[PDB]
Write a protein that binds this ligand. Structure first.
Ligand SMILES: [Mn+2]
Ligand SMILES: [Mn+2]
Lengths: 389, 389
C-alpha cells in the first residue's frame, strides 16, 4: 500500500495521477494534496480521496477551502504556504511524491521530498533545467528514487537496464551497455514550413506555450538538458531525433546494436501509472495501442537552421546551470511576447540567443542563486522584447 | 570469464557466435565445438579458438579432423557421435551453451545442457516446437537460464520485465504486468500478391526453405508455438502482427498501456551477443541502426486466408505437441515438394492441413515419442505429395 503526496493536484498531471489512484484504490492512498488557488477543484478531490492534509498557496484560498470543506463535513486539515508544501513532501509515512508543481514554485517542495529520501515522481522541468547539479547530488545523498513522469524521459527510463533504473543519476551508462539515449520529438507544427517563411508565422498557426515550445523545440532542448542530468549522459551519449508520429516516445541504444523503445498512446496516465506502480504495473485506464490504426512511422535528423532553440539549449548545457536557468527564463518572456504579437515567431530563438549573449554570470549554488539568475534573465528579455516593439 | 560450448559451430549462427567471441576474447572462451561433417571449417575454428574438444557427426569426419588438426599441431581432442555432443553440453566448467544444432539432431544435446542447469542460448526451433512441454519442465527442475537467440524471441525477451527474464518459462506474465506478447513478422514475399494468384507462385519468386516458410508464415506460426512455451503465454496473451520493414523485431504490451520493443539491424550477431553478455552487453560488431536511413514503419493484422499455415500452427498448439511436431514434420516435406515442382505454392498449406487431419495420435512424453510422430507425419506427407504428382 503506497501512500502519496501530490504537489499540484488540481493541474493536468494531478488529475491524471488521481485517476490512477481512483482505478487502483488497493495499491495507492492519497495522504496529502497540494494545489495553487483552485479551491473549487480541490474540494472535489479532498472529498473523493480524503487526504489527511490539503495545502493552498495563500491563507485566503486556505480559509475558503476550510469553509467549503467544513460544509461537506470533511476531516481534511487545511494549511497553506510553501513551507506547508515542503512538510507535505517530507511527511513521515508518505512513500511517493508527485512533484507536479511547476515553475520556481516547485523547486523547494521537490527538493524537500528528495532530501527526505522519498520516491519522487518527477513531473516538472524546472527541477533539472535550473538546479540539475544541485538536485542530482541531493538524490545521491538521500538515495531517493527518481522516476521521470514526462513522456520522453519515462520512455527512456523504461528502456534502460535495471541497474541504471535503481541508481538514477549516479549510474554509468557505458558501464551498463548503453551506447546512447535517443530523445525523440514531433518536430513541431512548422516542421515542413519552408525556412524563409518561419518569420511570418502567427500564434493561431501554432495551436499554448507548450505548442510554441514544440514549434521551436525549446521543449526538446529543455528535455536534452534534463536527460543529461537525469541519466548521467554526456553530449556524445545523446541523440535528438524527429519522429513526427510520436508513437515511439523515446529509445535507448545498446552496445550490441539493440535499440529499446517505449510506445503507446499520448495519454499521460501511462507514464504516470508506470512510475507509480514501479517496479510493477497497474491499469491506468489507457487504451491498448492499436498497431493497425497507425500512421507510418518516420524519423529524421533535426535541422538546426530550423530549430535554433535546440542548438542553443545544447550549447547552454555546456555553459552551465546559470546559462540553462536563463534560457528557460528568457524563453517564457519571448514565447509570451510572440504570443501577444510584439515579436515575430523567429524572434523567440533570436532574442533567446541575445539574452544569453548579453549576460555573463556565475554558476548557481542553491535554489536562491537560481531564482536570481531567472529574474535577471527575465529582465534582460523583458527589455529585449521592447527593443522590437 | 564465461566459458562455452557451441553446438553446431560451423553453421551460420555458429560463425556469428564465434565472431562475437573473437571481438570480446576478454569475456568469452570456447571450451568445446560441435559440428556436423564440415571438417574443413572446423579445423579453422579449432585452430583459432583452440577449444579443448571438437566433435563431429561420424568417426569418418572425426578421424579426418584428428589428422588435419594433427598437421597444424592442435591440442584439441576430437570425439564424435551424439553422446559426445550431449557430454559437451553438460561439461562441468562450461557456463553457456549455444544450442545451434537444428533438426532432431539437436534435441538431446540441448536437453542435456538443460538437465545440467546450464545457461542456454537457444538457437533452434525444434527444441520448443516439438518438445515444448518436456523441455520447459526440464528447465523448471534444473533451473537453467534459457536465453532465446532467434531475432523475434530475443526481442520479446529484451522487452520483458526482469523477474520474468530470470524465471523463463515458469513466470506469470499477467502477474508481472504483461498484457500480451507482440510477435512480428515481415509477412513474406507474397504479402501483396492478390489471393487468387498465390496458386501460381514459383520457387524463383521466393528467393530457400526459410524463404518459403516466410511466404507462407509457417515460420511465424512455428514462432507462435515456441513463444507460448518460452514465455508461458496463453493464446489471448499472444498477438501476431505484420510489420513489413522488420526494424522492430517484436514487442511486449503492458497493463498501463506501454509497449516496449527492440529494434536493430537484421544482423544475428546482435541477439547472439545479447544472450551471451546477459545481463550485460558487449559489442557484436554490428552497425548502429541509422534511424534516418529507414523505410516508413507500418503494421497490419495478418489475414488468415492469406497465411493458413499461421492459423494451422495456432490451432495445432491447442491440439498438443503431437500436432505441432507433425506440423513441423509435414511442412518440411511439402515446402521441399513445392521447391522441386511437384506441387503448387498453395499446396504447402493444404497438404499441411491434410497431414494433420488424416492423422490421430497421442501426446509425446520423451524425445523418442516426438521422433516417432515426426517420422509418422513425414510419411503421411511424403505420400500426400504423391497424390498430386
Ligand atoms: Mn515531453
Ligand atoms: Mn526468426
Amino acid at each position: 500500500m503506497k501512500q502519496l503526496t501530490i504537489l499540484g493536484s488540481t493541474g493536468s498531471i494531478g488529475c491524471s495521477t488521481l485517476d490512477v489512484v481512483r482505478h487502483n484504490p488497493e495499491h495507492f492512498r492519497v495522504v496529502a494534496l497540494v494545489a495553487g488557488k483552485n479551491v473549487t477543484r480541490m474540494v472535489e478531490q479532498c472529498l473523493e480521496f480524503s487526504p489527511r492534509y490539503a495545502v493552498m498557496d495563500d491563507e485566503a484560498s486556505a480559509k475558503l477551502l476550510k469553509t467549503m470543506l467544513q460544509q461537506q463535513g470533511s476531516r481534511t486539515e487545511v494549511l497553506s504556504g510553501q513551507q506547508a508544501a515542503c512538510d507535505m513532501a517530507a511527511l513521515e509515512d508518505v512513500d511517493q511524491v508527485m512533484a507536479a508543481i511547476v515553475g520556481a514554485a516547485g523547486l523547494l517542495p521537490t527538493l524537500a521530498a528528495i532530501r527526505a529520501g522519498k520516491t519522487i515522481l518527477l513531473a516538472n522541468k524546472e527541477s533539472l533545467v535550473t538546479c540539475g547539479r544541485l538536485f542530482m547530488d541531493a538524490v545521491k545523498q538521500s538515495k531517493a528514487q527518481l522516476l521521470p513522469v514526462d513522456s520522453e524521459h519515462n520512455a527512456i527510463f523504461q528502456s534502460l537496464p535495471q541497474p541504471i533504473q535503481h541508481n538514477l543519476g549516479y549510474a554509468d551508462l557505458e558501464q551498463n551497455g548503453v551506447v546512447s539515449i535517443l530523445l525523440t520529438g514531433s518536430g513541431g507544427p512548422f516542421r515542413e514550413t519552408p525556412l524563409r517563411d518561419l518569420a511570418t508565422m502567427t500564434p493561431d498557426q501554432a495551436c499554448r506555450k507548450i505548442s510554441v515550445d514544440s514549434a521551436t523545440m525549446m521543449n526538446k532542448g529543455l528535455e536534452y538538458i534534463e536527460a543529461r542530468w537525469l541519466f548521467n549522459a554526456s553530449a556524445s551519449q545523446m541523440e535528438v531525433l524527429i519522429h513526427p508520429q510520436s508513437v515511439i516516445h523515446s529509445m535507448v541504444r545498446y552496445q550490441d546494436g539493440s535499440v529499446l523503445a517505449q510506445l503507446g498512446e499520448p495519454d499521460m496516465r501511462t507514464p504516470i501509472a508506470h512510475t507509480m506502480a514501479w517496479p510493477n504495473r497497474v491499469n491506468s485506464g489507457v487504451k491498448p495501442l492499436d498497431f493497425c490504426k497507425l500512421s507510418a512511422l518516420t524519423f529524421a535528423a533535426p535541422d538546426y537552421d530550423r530549430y535554433p532553440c535546440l542548438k542553443l539549449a545544447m550549447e547552454a548545457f555546456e555553459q552551465g546551470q546559470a546559462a540553462t536557468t536563463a534560457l528557460n527564463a528568457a524563453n517564457e518572456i519571448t514565447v509570451a511576447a510572440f504570443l501577444a504579437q510584439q515579436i515575430r515567431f523567429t524572434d523567440i530563438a533570436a532574442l533567446n540567443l541575445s539574452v544569453l549573449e548579453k549576460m555573463d554570470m556565475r554558476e548557481p549554488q542553491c535554489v536562491d542563486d537560481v531564482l536570481s539568475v531567472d529574474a535577471n534573465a527575465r529582465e534582460v528579455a523583458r527589455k529585449e522584447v521592447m527593443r522590437l516593439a
